[PDB]
Motif scaffolding. Structure first.
Motif, PDB file in Angstrom:
ATOM      1  N   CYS G   4       0.864  -1.174   0.000  1.00  9.74           N
ATOM      2  CA  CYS G   4       0.000   0.000   0.000  1.00  9.74           C
ATOM      3  C   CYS G   4       0.903   1.226   0.000  1.00  9.74           C
ATOM      4  N   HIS G  20      -7.171  -3.870   4.330  1.00 10.35           N
ATOM      5  CA  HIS G  20      -6.582  -2.538   4.464  1.00 10.35           C
ATOM      6  C   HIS G  20      -7.418  -1.536   3.668  1.00 10.35           C
ATOM      7  N   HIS G  23      -6.525   3.272   6.772  1.00 13.21           N
ATOM      8  CA  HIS G  23      -6.161   3.701   5.431  1.00 13.21           C
ATOM      9  C   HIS G  23      -6.785   5.039   5.060  1.00 13.21           C
TER      10      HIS G  23
HETATM   11 ZN   LIG Z   1      -3.672   1.937   2.848  1.00 14.50          ZN
END
Ligand SMILES: [Zn+2]
Ligand SMILES: [Zn+2]
Ligand SMILES: [Zn+2]
Ligand SMILES: [Zn+2]
Ligand SMILES: [Zn+2]
Lengths: 144, 201, 70, 89, 198, 441, 32, 72, 78
Positions: G4, G20, G23
């Motif tokens: 990410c 996720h 975030h």
């Molecule tokens: Zn993230």
RNA sequence: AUCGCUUCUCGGCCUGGCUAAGAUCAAGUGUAGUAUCUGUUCUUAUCAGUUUAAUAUCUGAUGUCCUCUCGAGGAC
């Protein structure tokens, strides 16, 4: 018989040692250890020193498996290349100000001195005499 | 010519560009291997020989495409070996009439040895295979390894010891037959090859 | 580690003194000069001294390496 | 294939000869490899003498074959390091 | 208890080898004497960093591998990628069908080409120096490209034959103030290839 | 480059030598380590010339060389202490004209390390055990026993390591048929390192430590520890039993002191100086080369002075205490690093520079023109009997084995008219120096 | 490996990145 | 602005350099980065010494007595 | 005025080509070459922050005569 | 020519039968150790003790005398 392929596997191990993951560095350290113990006494110390230039930055790792691989690779490199280059690598860090860095360097130097107690006298650095005691031996300056 | 290689207490060979016309002294080449070299025998312009205080013979050549008017450049050790005694002097000249123009080195213990450069790759491979067979077939009397004794100070590099090649001919006949079967030849052919290597000088 | 590894000749630690390391290096150099025949011949026949006299001088110089400690 | 525990003896070697069981047969006594068994194993002291006669220099089974060092450990001559019989401490 | 950096610079012959935190060491003079030799290496930089060694990248992409020239001259990559692409389109029904009924003779080229690439076409690679230490960078600053010398791409782009158009202004303007120790050959120090200076 | 290095001129400088019945017969065998190769010679004493019977290259550095014979064995096995950690006991085979290794026991790491044993080697006089000790802080002793086929059955050695205890010299004393013992010249080093003022270094002195090998108890214990005022640069063992008392003799600068196991007279005999010597008196005279020769009934010793003259000293033991040692200069010999006094009219002295001398000892050792100084003879502690330089009267030199060690410089050229080119090497030490031109045909 | 970049977080499994989706706060922090 | 970076970055201790106007910069990274700057390069030019490696360790005005114009 | 705006270039002359030209001529400490979120191509003009003001002055005066990727590169004080 | 309707051409834009849903299924450890998710995290004042290569951690007071009603005034 690996000396025909040390130069082939050198950039693969060089790319493996620069990886983020500790598994690649540990297994490449095992590669350097077995390759150093394999073709000892055959003049391939340039590629071994080039691989040591990537192995020796990885001595600050904290996991036990990768540091055991680093210690085995350092032992194999001290067997293959010679104790002079290991003493050159450890002389600037045995008197390090940091406790942990000088402790790890003293562990590596103690392993090298256990392995190479006889050969470290000729590879000892040329330090002059100081105010504490005389250091420059006059027996080495004698010429017959 | 235009260069002087000096042997120091720490460095085995330091080459300085001998610009006597320019009246300037600049060290062209340095070294990384520490050796108290007590001898000099230049096989070439960039090649310097050294006899360390621990009895190690080291022939080091400079790197190719090296600038003569520069500094901070090292010379790679082309060959390194241990002769078993403190080597005093070395001269790159033929010690026998004709044959091979080798380098003759005299040691401080009373020994003199000629380092004949093998110009044949097949003969060098046969000598290396014979040495690898004889290092396992005939162990040393002191208990130390031959490669450990020949590389006590620094590790060996492209150096073949003729003492094991001489002792291979002095072995027992069953051991000579086993060594000839391992070398895939005859023991008389190996003795003839050793005699030709001795007569090459 | 091992107890005999730290108890070996030439061993040290992270708090090893520079004078102690220099004295150990000098004692190891004297022991290597005494053990080697060629090194003792090179350091003995250069001067006008006997081989056993040079060995006794090296045995005195081994104790002299512990001469001025700090 | 090792463990951080189990220091062995660190004793001076003697004339007693090492002995390996079949469950861990062929392994090097130091680096646990299977390549070039070169040097015989000496087990120093009362590791051999007494009830532990002909036993394993590893785990502890009834030994059947002679233990050996590999050529890679004897490259640095680790075989003179001492007795390799495992004492569980 | 410990002196400053000026006393260490005056005591040692190499003030550049004195570190910023070398004065707090127990033997600063011995460390400066050991660091001033010709064959020493520095401490790796991770002892001061909180970040672990080569660990904090976390977002970049890299090329997979660059094979050497003799391995690509054997050309194993072409039918290896063809076999991988053929196996990627296979189903597991076809996978156990090929498992119980194998098909050999896939590559089946020779032994002599690999024997020549291992021995006849064996090339010595580029190895770095003994004192080199790899770090988090050490893959981008490859100029050590001399200063005072224009690059080959800039010489080809500006139409410089091997006379650049700005070399006359560089000769009339003297040495640059950013690099006064750099000497440009041909105009200031009277230069092989694209490196026409140092 | 690929270099096949071969040695043409072999090194002949013998750093150490031993002698005995190593040939397995009545012929005397002397083995001298000339560097990387050890040569064993059994020359005829009737001819007088020294001829090497065999020579074997071991490819190593020998720190201590010794030989020993078993109980009733006609062959004296040679125990070699090299730079490797494997102590090797070998038996010479005269049928193959070479030495065969009877046993080889590993002790430690290779090389000439400080704690690695092999710097000092000694054997029991009764053929019971062999002791190898390091230069510092390590010693061991393995019991040597005869097998059922009269084979040297080695044993596991017992640890004799003490913290900061350097050893100058050591010798196994003659204990007869009892348990064997070995004496060593121990020197403490812990107090010299601990005290920074250096007062403990001046306060330290060499001590004779005799340790008895309890073979029945399977342990090693230090029996006696006598501190000595003079530092021991050398140590010799008097022939105990029927050839005299069982004790040791420590030599220093013009002081030789003999002490037995227990209460004995410390006869501090001064060295017999030369009659009006031109050398300075600041350089002390010590027995650098010592050779104890035991006859069928009596025994004697041969010592090297500062000038290099071989001096014969009789053993006036008188079954109670060390009374007299008639130190008379028997002959004038060259600068020898080691001298051996064999039987049947043989005396080999290995010169450190120049030619080693193999003399024929036709006389009984009393054929010397020099004066005699006795340990029982009193003096004012300032001079001894002025032993003038006598000629080769007791032993006549019958072989001069030329050795080029030490070597200084050399040059080889075909300037002369010969079948081979001439290699002229200028070499030598002191006034004993020459330029040797060598040429072949 | 899954990464990410808005969070700069590595993921061992596909469902680790699939979970996720903190975030949002990391996206608001990396937006400026 | 966060404070954990201010703690574990050395920014909590501010270090002054005498030659660049006696400027007190936060963090030891800035003080060790003064040896290649613009205004502090002007400061060592005003000291009278060229910017060399031996000038890369000096942090005092007096250290110009041990400059490049001291030995030759 | 350590920062200098370097323009008059093309798509072949990029930030690394400008860094190579800086290493030839005069050193720049930092490079600022922002790009669009749709095209993402180098415009040939960027802010090179030099380590000294004299380096930017020599870039604006002496080094503003080269032909970077076919177009005449001009360095202005910024 | 503008506007609305109708028709057509061309350019990016939603678009797979029936049967019992046709039927059925789907298993690993243990001991160490590492890495990544997720949560908790970090603004009070100088100095001193400890600690550290240095930070961090770490224990203690955070402008005094008088008066008036945490606030103000006075030789300070
Ligand atoms: Zn993230
Ligand atoms: Zn087992
Ligand atoms: Zn192994
Ligand atoms: Zn044991
Ligand atoms: Zn500053």
């Amino acid at each position: 018989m690996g000396k025909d392929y040390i130069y082939a596997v050198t950039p693969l191990l060089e790319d493996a040692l620069m990886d983020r993951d500790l598994v690649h560095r540990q297994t490449a350290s095992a590669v350097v250890q077995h390759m150093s113990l394999g073709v000892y006494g055959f003049g391939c110390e340039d590629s071994l020193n080039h691989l040591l230039n990537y192995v020796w930055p990885n001595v600050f790792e904290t996991s036990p498996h990768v540091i055991q691989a680093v210690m085995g690779a350092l032992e194999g490199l001290r067997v293959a290349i010679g104790p002079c280059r290991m003493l050159q690598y450890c002389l600037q860090g045995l008197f390090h100000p940091a406790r942990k860095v000088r402790d790890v360097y003293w562990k590596i130097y103690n392993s090298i001195y256990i392995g190479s107690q006889d050969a470290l006298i000729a590879h000892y650095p040329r330090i002059y005499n100081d105010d504490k005691n005389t250091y420059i031996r006059y027996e080495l300056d004698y010429i017959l | 010519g235009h260069r002087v290689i000096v042997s120091d207490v720490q460095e085995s060979f330091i080459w300085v560009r001998y610009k006597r016309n320019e009246n300037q002294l600049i060290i062209f080449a340095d070294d990384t291997y520490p050796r108290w070299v007590t001898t000099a025998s230049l096989l070439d312009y960039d090649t310097v020989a050294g006899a360390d205080k621990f009895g190690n013979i080291c022939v080091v050549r400079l790197p190719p495409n090296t600038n003569d008017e520069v500094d901070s450049q090292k010379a790679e050790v082309i060959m390194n070996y241990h002769v078993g005694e403190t080597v005093l002097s070395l001269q790159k000249t033929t010690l026998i009439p004709g044959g091979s123009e080798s380098l003759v080195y005299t040691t401080l213990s009373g020994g003199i040895g000629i380092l004949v450069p093998f110009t044949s790759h097949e003969d060098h491979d046969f000598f290396q295979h014979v040495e690898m067979h004889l290092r396992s077939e005939h162990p040393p009397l002191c208990g130390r390894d031959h490669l450990s004794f020949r590389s006590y100070y620094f590790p060996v590099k492209n150096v073949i010891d003729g003492d094991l090649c001489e002792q291979f001919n002095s072995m027992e006949p069953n051991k000579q037959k086993n060594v000839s079967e391992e070398l895939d030849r005859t023991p008389p052919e190996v003795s003839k090859k050793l005699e030709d290597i001795r007569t090459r000088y | 580690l091992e107890h005999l590894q730290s108890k070996y000749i030439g061993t040290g630690h992270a708090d090893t003194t520079k004078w102690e390391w220099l004295v150990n290096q000098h004692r190891d150099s004297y022991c290597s000069y005494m053990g080697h025949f060629d090194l003792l011949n090179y350091f003995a026949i250069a001067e006008n001294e006997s081989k056993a006299r040079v060995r006794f001088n090296l045995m005195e110089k081994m104790l002299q390496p512990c001469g001025p400690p700090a | 294939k090792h463990h951080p525990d189990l220091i062995f003896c660190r004793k001076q070697a003697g004339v007693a000869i090492g002995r390996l069981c079949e469950k861990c047969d062929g392994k090097c006594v130091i680096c646990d490899s299977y390549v070039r068994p070169c040097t015989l194993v000496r087990i120093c002291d009362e590791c051999n003498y007494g009830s532990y006669q002909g036993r394993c220099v590893i785990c502890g089974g009834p030994g059947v074959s002679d233990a050996y060092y590999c050529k890679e450990c004897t490259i640095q001559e680790k075989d003179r390091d001492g007795c390799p019989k495992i004492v569980n401490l | 208890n410990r002196f400053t950096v000026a006393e260490l610079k005056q005591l040692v012959a190499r003030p550049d080898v004195v570190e910023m935190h070398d004065v707090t060491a127990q033997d600063p003079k011995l460390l400066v004497h050991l660091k001033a030799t010709r064959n020493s290496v520095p401490v790796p930089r991770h002892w001061c960093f909180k970040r672990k060694y080569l660990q904090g990248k976390r977002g970049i992409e890299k090329p997979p591998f660059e094979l050497p020239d003799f391995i690509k001259r054997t050309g194993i990559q072409e039918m290896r990628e063809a076999l991988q692409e053929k196996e990627e389109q296979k189903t597991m029904k076809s996978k156990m069908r090929e498992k119980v009924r194998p098909k050999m003779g896939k590559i089946d080229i020779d032994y002599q080409k690999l024997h020549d690439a291992f021995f006849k076409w064996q090339t010595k690679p580029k190895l770095t120096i003994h004192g080199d230490l790899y770090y988090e960078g050490k893959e981008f600053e490859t100029r050590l490209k001399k200063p005072g010398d224009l690059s080959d791409e800039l010489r080809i782009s500006l139409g410089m034959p091997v006379p650049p158009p700005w070399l006359i202004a560089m000769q009339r303007y003297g040495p640059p103030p950013s690099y006064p120790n750099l000497k440009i050959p041909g105009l200031n120090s009277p230069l092989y290839g694209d490196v026409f200076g140092t | 480059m690929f270099l096949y290095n071969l040695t043409l001129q072999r090194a002949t400088g013998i750093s150490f030598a031993i002698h005995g019945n190593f040939s397995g017969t009545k012929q005397q065998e002397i083995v001298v380590s000339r560097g990387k190769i050890l040569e064993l010679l059994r020359p005829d004493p009737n001819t007088g010339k020294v001829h090497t019977l065999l020579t074997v290259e071991v490819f190593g550095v020998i720190r201590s060389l010794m030989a020993f014979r078993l109980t009733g064995g006609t062959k004296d096995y040679i125990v070699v202490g090299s730079d490797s950690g494997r102590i090797v006991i070998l038996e010479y085979q005269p049928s193959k004209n070479m030495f065969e290794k009877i046993h080889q026991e590993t002790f430690g790491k290779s090389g000439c390390r400080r704690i690695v044993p092999g710097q000092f080697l000694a054997v029991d006089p009764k053929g019971r055990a062999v002791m190898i000790s390091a230069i510092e802080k390590q010693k061991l002793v393995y019991i040597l026993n005869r097998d059922a086929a009269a084979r040297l059955t080695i044993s596991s050695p017992l640890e004799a390591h003490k913290a900061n205890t350097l050893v100058y010299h050591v010798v196994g004393v003659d204990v007869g048929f009892e348990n064997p013992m070995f004496a060593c010249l121990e020197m403490d080093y812990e107090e010299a390192d601990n005290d920074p003022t250096g007062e403990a270094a001046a306060n330290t002195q060499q001590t004779l430590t005799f340790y008895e090998l309890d073979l029945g108890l399977n342990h090693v214990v230090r029996k006696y520890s006598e501190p000595l005022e003079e530092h021991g640069n050398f140590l010799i063992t008097v022939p105990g039993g029927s050839d005299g008392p069982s004790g040791v003799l420590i030599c220093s600068e013009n002081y030789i002191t003999y002490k037995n196991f227990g209460d004995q007279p410390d006869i501090r005999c001064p060295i017999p100086r030369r009659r009006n010597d031109l050398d300075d008196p600041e350089r002390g005279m010590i027995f650098v080369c010592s050779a104890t020769h035991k006859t069928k009934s009596m025994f004697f010793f041969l010592a090297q002075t500062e000038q290099g003259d071989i001096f014969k000293i009789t053993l006036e033991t008188d079954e109670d205490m060390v009374t007299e040692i008639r130190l008379k200069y028997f002959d004038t010999v060259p600068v020898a690093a080691a001298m051996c006094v064999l039987k049947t009219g043989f005396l080999f002295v290995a010169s450190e520079f120049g030619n080693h001398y193999l003399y024929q000892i036709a006389h009984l050792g009393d054929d010397d023109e020099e004066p005699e100084f006795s340990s029982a003879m009193p003096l004012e502690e300032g001079d001894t009997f002025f032993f003038q330089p006598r000629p080769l009267k007791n032993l006549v030199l019958v072989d001069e084995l030329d050795s080029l060690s030490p070597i200084l410089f050399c040059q080889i050229a075909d300037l002369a008219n010969e079948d081979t080119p001439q290699l002229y090497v200028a070499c030598g030490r002191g006034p004993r120096s020459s330029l040797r031109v060598l040429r072949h045909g | 490996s899954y990464e990410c970049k808005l969070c700069l977080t590595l993921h061992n499994n596909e469902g680790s990145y699939l979970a996720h989706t903190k975030h949002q706060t990391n996206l608001a922090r990396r937006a400026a | 602005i966060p404070y954990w970076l201010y703690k574990l970055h050395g920014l909590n201790i501010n270090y002054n350099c005498e030659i660049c106007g006696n400027y007190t910069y936060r963090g030891p990274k800035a003080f060790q980065r003064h040896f290649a700057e613009w205004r502090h390069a002007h400061g060592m030019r005003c000291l009278g010494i060229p910017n060399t490696a031996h000038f890369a360790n000096v942090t005092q005005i007096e250290d110009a007595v041990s400059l490049w114009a001291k030995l030759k | 005025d350590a920062t200098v705006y370097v323009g008059g270039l093309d798509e072949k002359v990029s930030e690394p080509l400008l860094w190579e030209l800086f290493l030839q001529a005069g050193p720049v400490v930092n490079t600022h070459m922002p790009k669009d979120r749709v095209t993402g191509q180098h415009q040939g003009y960027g802010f090179v922050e030099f380590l000294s003001e004299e380096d930017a002055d020599y870039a604006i005066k002496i080094m503003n005569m080269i032909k970077l990727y076919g177009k005449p590169i001009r360095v202005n004080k910024a």
